[PDB]
Scaffold this active site. Structure first.
Site, PDB file in Angstrom:
ATOM      1  N   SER B  49       0.778  -1.252   0.000  1.00 18.70           N
ATOM      2  CA  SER B  49       0.000   0.000   0.000  1.00 18.70           C
ATOM      3  C   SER B  49       0.803   1.292   0.000  1.00 18.70           C
ATOM      4  O   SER B  49       0.263   2.335  -0.366  1.00 18.70           O
ATOM      5  CB  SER B  49      -1.016   0.034   1.134  1.00 18.70           C
ATOM      6  OG  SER B  49      -2.057  -0.888   0.872  1.00 18.70           O
ATOM      7  N   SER B  97      -6.625   1.717   2.569  1.00 19.95           N
ATOM      8  CA  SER B  97      -5.842   0.965   1.587  1.00 19.95           C
ATOM      9  C   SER B  97      -6.716   0.126   0.672  1.00 19.95           C
ATOM     10  O   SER B  97      -6.551  -1.099   0.598  1.00 19.95           O
ATOM     11  CB  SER B  97      -4.790   0.098   2.281  1.00 19.95           C
ATOM     12  OG  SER B  97      -3.895   0.910   3.010  1.00 19.95           O
ATOM     13  N   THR B 188       0.756   3.179   5.583  1.00 14.59           N
ATOM     14  CA  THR B 188       1.127   1.803   5.936  1.00 14.59           C
ATOM     15  C   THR B 188       1.219   0.895   4.703  1.00 14.59           C
ATOM     16  O   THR B 188       0.680   1.214   3.638  1.00 14.59           O
ATOM     17  CB  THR B 188       0.071   1.165   6.846  1.00 14.59           C
ATOM     18  OG1 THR B 188      -1.183   1.193   6.164  1.00 14.59           O
ATOM     19  CG2 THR B 188      -0.055   1.885   8.178  1.00 14.59           C
ATOM     20  N   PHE B 190       1.447  -3.639   3.772  1.00 11.86           N
ATOM     21  CA  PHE B 190       1.464  -5.026   4.235  1.00 11.86           C
ATOM     22  C   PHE B 190       1.230  -5.954   3.044  1.00 11.86           C
ATOM     23  O   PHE B 190       0.158  -5.941   2.440  1.00 11.86           O
ATOM     24  CB  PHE B 190       0.423  -5.235   5.345  1.00 11.86           C
ATOM     25  CG  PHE B 190       0.319  -6.656   5.845  1.00 11.86           C
ATOM     26  CD1 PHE B 190       1.462  -7.411   6.122  1.00 11.86           C
ATOM     27  CD2 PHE B 190      -0.933  -7.225   6.067  1.00 11.86           C
ATOM     28  CE1 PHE B 190       1.354  -8.726   6.596  1.00 11.86           C
ATOM     29  CE2 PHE B 190      -1.059  -8.535   6.540  1.00 11.86           C
ATOM     30  CZ  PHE B 190       0.086  -9.290   6.806  1.00 11.86           C
ATOM     31  N   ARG B 232       4.038  -2.195  13.440  1.00 15.50           N
ATOM     32  CA  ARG B 232       4.557  -1.373  12.353  1.00 15.50           C
ATOM     33  C   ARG B 232       4.431   0.105  12.689  1.00 15.50           C
ATOM     34  O   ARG B 232       5.186   0.920  12.175  1.00 15.50           O
ATOM     35  CB  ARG B 232       3.882  -1.703  11.006  1.00 15.50           C
ATOM     36  CG  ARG B 232       2.449  -1.206  10.856  1.00 15.50           C
ATOM     37  CD  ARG B 232       1.807  -1.721   9.584  1.00 15.50           C
ATOM     38  NE  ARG B 232       0.353  -1.592   9.668  1.00 15.50           N
ATOM     39  CZ  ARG B 232      -0.502  -1.903   8.698  1.00 15.50           C
ATOM     40  NH1 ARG B 232      -0.065  -2.378   7.541  1.00 15.50           N
ATOM     41  NH2 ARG B 232      -1.803  -1.736   8.887  1.00 15.50           N
TER      42      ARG B 232
END
EC number: 3.5.2.6
Lengths: 244, 247
Positions: B49, B97, B188, B190, B232
């Site tokens: 993302s 996201s 962020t 992932f 994170r």
């Protein structure tokens, strides 16, 4: 179109506050308010003038750009928190009066009048000193006109570059959450005199989901201990309506 | 950037949660960076993302995104998360996201133009192969912590090969925390829990404006379990809290 809403009054009542909240969903084409008369009553903008003043400073080159730093000359300022170098957003967030006073001096009386006309900003009355017309002078604006002005800023519809409107909009973010985004500015003219209270403001807009809500609040104030109400009353209202 | 130094003191936050990761923290004025791990700081990982940042820039630049008030309409066909099953604004798709939304943007941008802008932006290895709608989540594009902070610094300074206006639009979309003393812009990433022995990667990148200073950061960490995800944010948050930047 301004429609009276009686179901917010308890929030003014419970606090013994004489004020007005104006809230418009999607646009200024229909707004809700506790007080029709007061919604269009015109008050001193105080630091809420930092919004148009900031746009004007950028437009005229007085604020060179987005990354401009307002250096402190070491000379005493009215609040300790203004005694340091500040970015535009820093200076707006702590309402550094002297920074924006100097911006207005450099914009000057002729250009300031020009833009207040284009912006349709209140009574457009800048008379009586370039560095104090918004604090103790004759400039006046209403909750309604504040909302109309902020909507134009939101839509980039002010007579100013998209770029400068974007720059000022970022300096106004005051709350970010995953669910919503708040742009806002406070104002406070002072405690007023013999039976003439000052005014306190909180103006802005909230973006939630795909919706937008423009708001403006003002209240009479003769005691600074009462100042947190300028945010807590309208925050209460927008929490119950489900906006924030 | 202008210099980097390894500062193994921050390891405390990693060891605590037994995390294999890297935080890079750069001070704008002095042009210097500090990291706990110089080696990992240059290692290249799937953006996931975090790529929504350049893609957003590109999407606006090419005109695929009309402007900042553009709403990305949800049709009704099921999506991978309940969050993504609604109409979103640019900031919305960024904050949740919403993969499909940016997948669509990517296709409409196309490979030639995507290759071109990533070349302009100096974005990682610049490998957009393995589809055009997954090259950053499960494809071949890789980026380093150092490259993120340089990229993000260019965005902040409006120095990317895109209009200042478009960079301002994206920048506002990236605001995640506002306080009267500091402003946080962040995103962020992932890629997934990964495979055996080769775990996935989680990102948190952005910058913090505090006083007249600006702090560009980039965090990534190995990840094999979604439960670990919130680390994170909490590791770098604690690093920057103890640096006095936030809080």
């Amino acid at each position: 179109s301004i429609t009276e809403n009686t179901s917010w009054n308890k929030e003014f009542s419970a606090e013994a506050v004489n004020g007005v909240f104006v809230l418009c969903k999607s646009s200024s084409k229909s707004c809700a308010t506790n007080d029709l008369a007061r919604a269009s009553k015109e008050y001193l903008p105080a630091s809420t003038f930092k919004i148009p003043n900031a746009i004007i400073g950028l437009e005229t080159g007085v604020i060179k750009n987005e990354h401009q730093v307002f250096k402190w000359d070491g000379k005493p300022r009215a609040m300790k928190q203004w005694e340091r170098d500040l970015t535009l957003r820093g200076a707006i967030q702590v309402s550094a009066v002297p920074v924006f006073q100097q911006i207005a001096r450099e914009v000057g009386e002729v250009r300031m009048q020009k833009y207040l006309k284009k912006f349709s900003y209140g009574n457009q009355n800048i008379s009586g000193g370039i560095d104090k017309f918004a604090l103790e002078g004759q400039l006046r604006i209403s909750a309604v006109n504040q909302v109309e002005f902020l909507e134009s800023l939101y839509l980039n519809k002010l007579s100013a570059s998209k770029e400068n409107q974007l720059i000022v909009k970022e300096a106004l973010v005051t709350e970010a959450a995953p669910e919503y985004l708040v742009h806002s500015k406070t104002g406070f003219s002072g405690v007023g005199t013999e039976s003439n209270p000052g005014v306190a403001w909180w103006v802005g807009w909230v973006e939630k989901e795909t919706e937008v809500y423009f708001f403006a609040f003002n209240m009479d104030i003769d005691n600074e201990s009462k100042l947190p109400l300028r945010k807590s009353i309208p925050t209460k209202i927008m929490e119950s309506e489900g906006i924030i």
